Amino acid sequence: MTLGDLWKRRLNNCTKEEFFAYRRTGILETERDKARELLRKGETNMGLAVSRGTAKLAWLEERGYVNLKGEVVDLGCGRGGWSYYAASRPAVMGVKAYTIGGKGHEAPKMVTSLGWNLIKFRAGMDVFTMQPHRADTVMCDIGESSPDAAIEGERTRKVILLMEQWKNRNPSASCVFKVLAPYRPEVIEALHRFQLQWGGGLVRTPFSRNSTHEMYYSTAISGNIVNSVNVQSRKLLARFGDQRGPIRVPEMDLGVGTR
Numbered sequence: 257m258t259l260g261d262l263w264k265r266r267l268n269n270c271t272k273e274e275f276f277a278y279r280r281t282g283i284l285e286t287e288r289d290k291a292r293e294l295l296r297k298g299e300t301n302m303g304l305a306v307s308r309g310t311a312k313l314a315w316l317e318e319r320g321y322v323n324l325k326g327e328v329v330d331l332g333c334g335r336g337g338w339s340y341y342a343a344s345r346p347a348v349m350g351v352k353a354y355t356i357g358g359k360g361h362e363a364p365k366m367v368t369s370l371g372w373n374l375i376k377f378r379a380g381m382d383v384f385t386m387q388p389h390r391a392d393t394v395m396c397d398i399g400e401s402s403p404d405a406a407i408e409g410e411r412t413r414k415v416i417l418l419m420e421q422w423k424n425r426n427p428s429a430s431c432v433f434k435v436l437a438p439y440r441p442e443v444i445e446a447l448h449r450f451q452l453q454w455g456g457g458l459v460r461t462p463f464s465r466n467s468t469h470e471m472y473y474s475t476a477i478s479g480n481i482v483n484s485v486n487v488q489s490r491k492l493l494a495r496f497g498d499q500r501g502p503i504r505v506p507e508m509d510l511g512v513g514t515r
């Protein structure tokens with residue numbers, strides 16, 4: 257058993273009030289009140305982020321932890337926050353975005369956010385059975401939370417296997433992907449094997465809620481994986497009992513128009 261396993265048990269043991277105070281204490285939160293209503297009313301001419309995912313990828317890029325370029329694939333694009341971020345980047349030439357859609361899942365939001373014309377959205381696509389194709393940058397933000405840590409571990413293992421398949425097709429591609437449950441030993445083993453062949457490392461974005469242990473793997477950073485995970489678990493465990501709220505910041509606005 258790991259510290260993150262204990263974190264997950266302590267999380268599930270929270271009362272409702274305990275859970276909601278813990279969830280958001282100390283985290284960066286974009287201000288989505290304008291964005292939310294524009295999406296709700298169906299405004300397509302907008303550059304405000306279509307989801308909270310945009311600011312997370314923006315943070316990874318601005319830190320230099322990912323370098324989005326060339327032909328980008330977005331595996332599990334959901335509403336498209338990563339696809340629109342990538343399409344607005346001058347070094348990106350095109351985005352192929354894929355998501356399952358269906359009941360309980362987000363379909364792509366269609367807006368004129370800068371570079372939208374460079375995105376080819378395909379909904380109703382399962383990426384886990386899709387044949388990989390050429391890409392310079394491979395992005396994947398898949399990993400659905402579960403109260404069951406073993407399910408979160410297996411969901412995470414499937415994402416890492418997917419990234420191995422896309423690296424097999426594209427050994428030189430940069431990769432960035434969500435690791436939902438890095439605290440699980442089957443996940444650590446798979447991350448080690450990936451890191452040994454492809455390099456890379458783990459990082460926590462300051463926008464992730466304390467109710468998830470998610471971290472992001474990128475081929476462009478480094479770091480011992482176990483220590484990265486353990487630092488994050490201790491930091492998550494140390495926030496239990498904190499009552500401070502979130503730090504609110506402006507939402508990303510990419511502007512509108514074609515590229």
Ligand SMILES: [C]O[C]1[C](OP([O])(=O)O[C][C]2O[C](N3[C]=NC4=C3N=C([N])[N]C4=O)[C]([O])[C]2[O])[C]([C]OP([O])(=O)OP([O])(=O)OP([O])(=O)O[C][C]2O[C](N3=[C]N([C])C4=C3N=C([N])[N]C4=O)[C]([O])[C]2[O])O[C]1N1[C]=NC2=C1N=[C]N=C2[N]
Nearest residue numbers: 267268269270271272275279400401402403404465467468
């Ligand atoms: C009920 O549940 C709930 C839900 O879930 P889902 O997701 O829907 O899934 C379902 C599933 O799972 C499982 N389970 C459940 N339960 C149980 C189980 N298992 C066992 N073994 N046992 C038990 O008990 C099964 O398999 C089924 O089928 C959830 C909700 O969520 P949503 O809405 O979806 O959102 P998201 O995105 O996910 O986010 P969040 O919210 O933040 O979450 C994350 C995490 O956290 C936690 N939580 C949540 N919540 C809401 C809560 C919590 N915790 C606490 N303590 N409290 C509260 O309230 C978890 O871990 C998650 O993952 O959730 C759930 N829940 C509710 N409640 C509860 C829960 N869990 C645990 N515990 C509790 N108390």
Ligand SMILES: Nc1ncnc2c1ncn2[C@@H]1O[C@H](CSCC[C@H](N)C(=O)O)[C@@H](O)[C@H]1O
Nearest residue numbers: 307309332334337338355356361382383397
């Ligand atoms: N097997 C699969 N094939 C395709 N899409 C999947 C999938 N499993 C999960 N997904 C989708 O992957 C998406 C992950 S959410 C990603 C958030 C996104 N990066 C943003 O910025 O908006 C979800 O919408 C989920 O429906």
